[PDB]
Amino acid sequence: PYNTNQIAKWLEAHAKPLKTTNPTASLNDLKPLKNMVGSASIVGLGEATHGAHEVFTMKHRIVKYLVSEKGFTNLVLEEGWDRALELDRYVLTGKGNPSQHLTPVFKTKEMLDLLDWIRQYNANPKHKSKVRVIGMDIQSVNENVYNNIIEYIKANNSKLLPRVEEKIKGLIPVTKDMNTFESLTKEEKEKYVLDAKTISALLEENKSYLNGKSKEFAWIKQNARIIEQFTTMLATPPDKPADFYLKHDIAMYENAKWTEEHLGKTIVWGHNGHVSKTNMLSFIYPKVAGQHLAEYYGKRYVSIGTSVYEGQYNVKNSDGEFGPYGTLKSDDPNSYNYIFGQVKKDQFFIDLRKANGVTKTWLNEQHPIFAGITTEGPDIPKTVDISLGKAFDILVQIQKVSPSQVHQ
Ligand SMILES: [Ca+2]
Structure with a gap:
């Protein structure tokens, strides 16, 4: 019978500390990622939710690291393929108005900073490669x-x-x-x-x-x-x-x-549910993109997921309006949120594939985790069961989040 308080201590000893969530800060704390990702051809980078500022910026930092240190040249967004055709044109030529084509929930300052950084990276003569922006969604x-x-x-x-x-x-x-x-x-x-x-x-x-x-x-x-x-x-x-x-x-x-x-x-930049190697969105999806990817690529696909603990985030309310109405309640001591939330570090990541002892066993069992759906409603679960060790190879925990900076 394992003790989750001990598990949280094992996590602390193996967690790689993240100094900040600021996109312009040094990328040095991400160095441990080099060998975690290895020679993977495609890396899934999930967001616990589509309405948190720190989650977006931390993902921005990772893209930055993967692009300049691991040769990644394409960013596939959980965005419509047609709309991204215009975002790609923006990072290639600097022409266009990005926020005009971004999906409403993604019309945020963080998203525009990510695209602007990509535009800048692509116009710098010192980089022998350009980053392309692709959209994998088909809502239109x-x-x-x-x-x-x-x-x-x-x-x-x-x-x-x-x-x-x-x-x-x-x-x-x-x-x-x-x-x-x-x-x-x-x-x-x-x-x-x-x-x-x-x-x-x-x-x-x-x-x-x-x-x-x-x-x-x-x-x-x-x-x-x-x-x-x-x-x-x-x-x-x-x-x-x-x-x-x-x-x-x-x-x-x-x-x-x-x-x-x-x-x-x-x-592959998208929601945790679309890049996880297991189906955590089973309440609506029979299978998710991440399962097809793992199934086809095997060790060539690396899945990185983000997780939260306390804070507020943007979500559609009871009236269907997108706003800062989300409040994290990681009250359950059996959830991954609470457990990872006890690690004494503002932000950190860890290789779940390297877990040992009871922590390894615990990671392969089904436990509750914040779902992060964009709508809050009677028929929309706020948490779902999942085997963290099976869904993700790498986990990035951010102990406190705040609302994404949605345009006004
Ligand atoms: Ca989504």
């Missing part, structure tokens, strides 16, 4: 995605445009948002699902007449893949309600995999 398929396909066909094989031109013209108005598409008739969604399949099929058979062995054709093909991901996910029949979510994270997984496979060492 705006017109910019369609124009990429239109533009590439017009330029490489304009003769093919007729076969695609208004399949996309009809798809544009119904993919502007999930509500428009799901509010369609069963027969309608299926026709659009076919229109998307056809567009992708068209690019595939005319591969040789479109400079198919190139890296730009790879991009185009993926852009078309996004349309299929969106249409298929929302064409899910009512007799299989769980498939909406299964397909959702299968797509995010595919987009994160596509990035690593075509662009290199990648960083």
